[PDB]
Amino acid sequence: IVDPGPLDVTALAVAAALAAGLHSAADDPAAALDKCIVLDELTEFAEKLVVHDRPGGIGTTVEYVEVYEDASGVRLGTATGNAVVLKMEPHMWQFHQSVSELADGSFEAVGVIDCTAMLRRMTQVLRVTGRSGRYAGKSGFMTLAISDPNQRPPHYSVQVVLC
Amino acid sequence: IVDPGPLDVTALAVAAALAAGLHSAADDPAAALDKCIVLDELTEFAEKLVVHDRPGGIGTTVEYVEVYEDASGVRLGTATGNAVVLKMEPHMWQFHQSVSELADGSFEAVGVIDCTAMLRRMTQVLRVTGRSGRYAGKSGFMTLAISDPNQRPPHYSVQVVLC
Numbered sequence: 001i002v003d004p005g006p007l008d009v010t011a012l013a014v015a016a017a018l019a020a021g022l023h024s025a026a027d028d029p030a031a032a033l034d035k036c037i038v039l040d041e042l043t044e045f046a047e048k049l050v051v052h053d054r055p056g057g058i059g060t061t062v063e064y065v066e067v068y069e070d071a072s073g074v075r076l077g078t079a080t081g082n083a084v085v086l087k088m089e090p091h092m093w094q095f096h097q098s099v100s101e102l103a104d105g106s107f108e109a110v111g112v113i114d115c116t117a118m119l120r121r122m123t124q125v126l127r128v129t130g131r132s133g134r135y136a137g138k139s140g141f142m143t144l145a146i147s148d149p150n151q152r153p154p155h156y157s158v159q160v161v162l163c
Numbered sequence: 164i165v166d167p168g169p170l171d172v173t174a175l176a177v178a179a180a181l182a183a184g185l186h187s188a189a190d191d192p193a194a195a196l197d198k199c200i201v202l203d204e205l206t207e208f209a210e211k212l213v214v215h216d217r218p219g220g221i222g223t224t225v226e227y228v229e230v231y232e233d234a235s236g237v238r239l240g241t242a243t244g245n246a247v248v249l250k251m252e253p254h255m256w257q258f259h260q261s262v263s264e265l266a267d268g269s270f271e272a273v274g275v276i277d278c279t280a281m282l283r284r285m286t287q288v289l290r291v292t293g294r295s296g297r298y299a300g301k302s303g304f305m306t307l308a309i310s311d312p313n314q315r316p317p318h319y320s321v322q323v324v325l326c
């Protein structure tokens with residue numbers, strides 16, 4: 001029950017470019033990294049959770065305000081969104097929609113993540129759409145993973161790559 | 164090394180509805196299933212594979228024709244797309260882009276998938292956009308998981324759910 005499988009920002013850059021419509025983007029990974037916005041070495045933790053429980057867990061909705069810290073420890077901004085438990089057994093799956101608000105703009109994240117896989121130290125991916133500032137008119141992916149698995153409340157390792 | 168965690172079509176219908184802008188869809192899971200286009204109990208397997216190998220694996224492209232079968236083995240159509248190996252270790256990650264062609268119309272799948280996690284028998288999720296016929300104007304998710312691992316050629320359980 002321990003199986004890390006991270007992505008690096010270069011890999012994320014190629015994913016971002018391929019999906020943006022730069023079909024030969026794997027030819028030069030460096031060139032793809034260079035043309036992307038990159039947020040590496042982020043952690044997020046919750047500052048507010050509003051939980052709306054349901055018997056047995058399926059349909060439990062969490063409104064959350066998560067805080068982004070950079071590698072030093074500076075607050076870059078918040079991720080405000082909704083989690084919905086789609087399923088509990090044998091894996092917990094949540095739907096996630098979040099708007100991330102930084103000083104230089106905003107981007108949305110949408111996805112469907114296997115929370116049990118994350119407890120196995122695995123990485124999940126959400127789809128990022130730019131919404132305001134330098135992120136506007138760009139798109140890519142966001143990685144999540146449990147930062148320290150013997151922490152409570154849990155902290156998340158986060159990368160964001162758009163182009 | 165065997166940790167399954169699948170998504171039922173009802174859980175996928177909720178996700179599709181939330182992703183689509185019907186924000187109360189967890190209220191009545193059955194009612195989200197009802198406004199959704201559902202393709203389930205079908206499998207795919209590789210018919211054509213054209214790999215262009217990159218030393219070290221990162222950048223290996225795969226051009227693929229997959230064939231869809233229903234639960235009684237009948238061919239329903241093809242999924243034609245492209246994969247790129249983003250990373251190999253510790254987990255092999257791949258970007259994917261496919262156009263599925265069925266009798267009742269077409270849909271495009273895009274996503275980044277952990278191929279190692281798939282060998283642990285875990286489900287991966289692609290985003291899906293309707294392109295024609297009953298799928299047109301609709302979005303949602305695709306799940307994949309190996310059905311039987313040391314079957315050859317290897318087969319993947321598929322669910323697609325849009326609205």
Ligand SMILES: COC(=O)c1ccc(COC(=O)N[C@H]2C=CCC[C@@H]2C(=O)N(C)C)cc1
Pocket residue numbers: 044060062064066079081083085096097098109115126144156
């Ligand atoms: C019933 O409640 C629970 O058992 C439970 C389970 C898991 C979690 C963790 O997930 C969250 O709440 N939300 C944030 C953190 C992780 C995923 C992404 C998400 C986030 O910041 N994004 C999308 C940027 C919270 C609660």
Ligand SMILES: COC(=O)c1ccc(COC(=O)N[C@H]2C=CCC[C@@H]2C(=O)N(C)C)cc1
Pocket residue numbers: 207209214220223225227229242244246248259260261272276278289307319
């Ligand atoms: C070095 O790596 C390889 O050579 C290699 C590894 C894995 C695979 C299997 O993946 C595929 O070909 N494609 C299909 C199967 C899996 C994901 C879904 C995908 C599919 O049908 N979709 C998205 C409709 C093929 C080649």
